[PDB]
Amino acid sequence: DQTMFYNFGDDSIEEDVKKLMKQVYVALEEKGYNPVNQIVGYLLSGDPAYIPRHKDARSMIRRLERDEIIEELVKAYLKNNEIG
Amino acid sequence: DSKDQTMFYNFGDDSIEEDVKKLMKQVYVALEEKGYNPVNQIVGYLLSGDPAYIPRHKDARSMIRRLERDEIIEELVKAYLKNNEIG
Numbered sequence: 001d002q003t004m005f006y007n008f009g010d011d012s013i014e015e016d017v018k019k020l021m022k023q024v025y026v027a028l029e030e031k032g033y034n035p036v037n038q039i040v041g042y043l044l045s046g047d048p049a050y051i052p053r054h055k056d057a058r059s060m061i062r063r064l065e066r067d068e069i070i071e072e073l074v075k076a077y078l079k080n081n082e083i084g
Numbered sequence: 085d086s087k088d089q090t091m092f093y094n095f096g097d098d099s100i101e102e103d104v105k106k107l108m109k110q111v112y113v114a115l116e117e118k119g120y121n122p123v124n125q126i127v128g129y130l131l132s133g134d135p136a137y138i139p140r141h142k143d144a145r146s147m148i149r150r151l152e153r154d155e156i157i158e159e160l161v162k163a164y165l166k167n168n169e170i171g
Contacts, residue, residue, distance in 0.1 A: 018168060021164065021165070021168070021170060022168075022170055025165065025170050025171055029171065035165070035171065036158060036161050036162055036165070039161050040154055040157045040158050040161055043130075043157050043161075044153060044154055044157060066131070067127050067131060070127045070130050070131065070157075070160075071123055071124075071127050072164075073157075073160040073161060073163075073164050074108075074123045074126050074127060074130075074160065075123055076160075076163065076164050076167060076168070077108060077159075077160050077163050077164070078108060078112060078122075078123070080163060080167040081105055081108065081109070081163075083108060083109050083112045083113075084112065084116065
């Protein structure tokens with residue numbers, strides 16, 4: 001309900017992960033992968049070889065901590081499931 | 085207003101989607117009530133598989149026993165793509 005103050009760079013992890021997931025999804029679909037399968041394999045194993053080099057998806061995903069991507073997945077899930 | 089027919093040993097009727105929602109709600113409430121950042125405990129659990137990250141509260145520990153982390157992370161990823169209209 002309450003208005004939030006915006007400080008330049010406030011939403012940087014949320015926005016960073018959103019940008020990354022959009023590009024990673026496109027890279028996976030274009031190369032014929034099951035995007036959910038490959039993202040799960042990467043997040044569980046930390047093995048970047050589950051992500052294509054296509055569209056620089058592998059290098060881009062390696063620039064974020066897996067814990068930061070999982071954090072955003074968890075925060076998004078709670079919010080979209082009205083948990084709070 | 086939910087119930088269960090006690091007519092054979094039942095190891096659960098919930099779908100994985102239902103189980104993940106129940107786990108995430110129970111853990112969030114338990115941690116939020118006690119002043120913890122719940123997201124950090126859930127993330128630490130998903131990175132490790134160590135139940136010590138999760139409070140012993142209701143059947144939290146029994147829910148993580150029954151779910152695999154690949155299934156929890158699959159549900160998180162599916163939900164994230166859906167809710168951000170990705171694909």
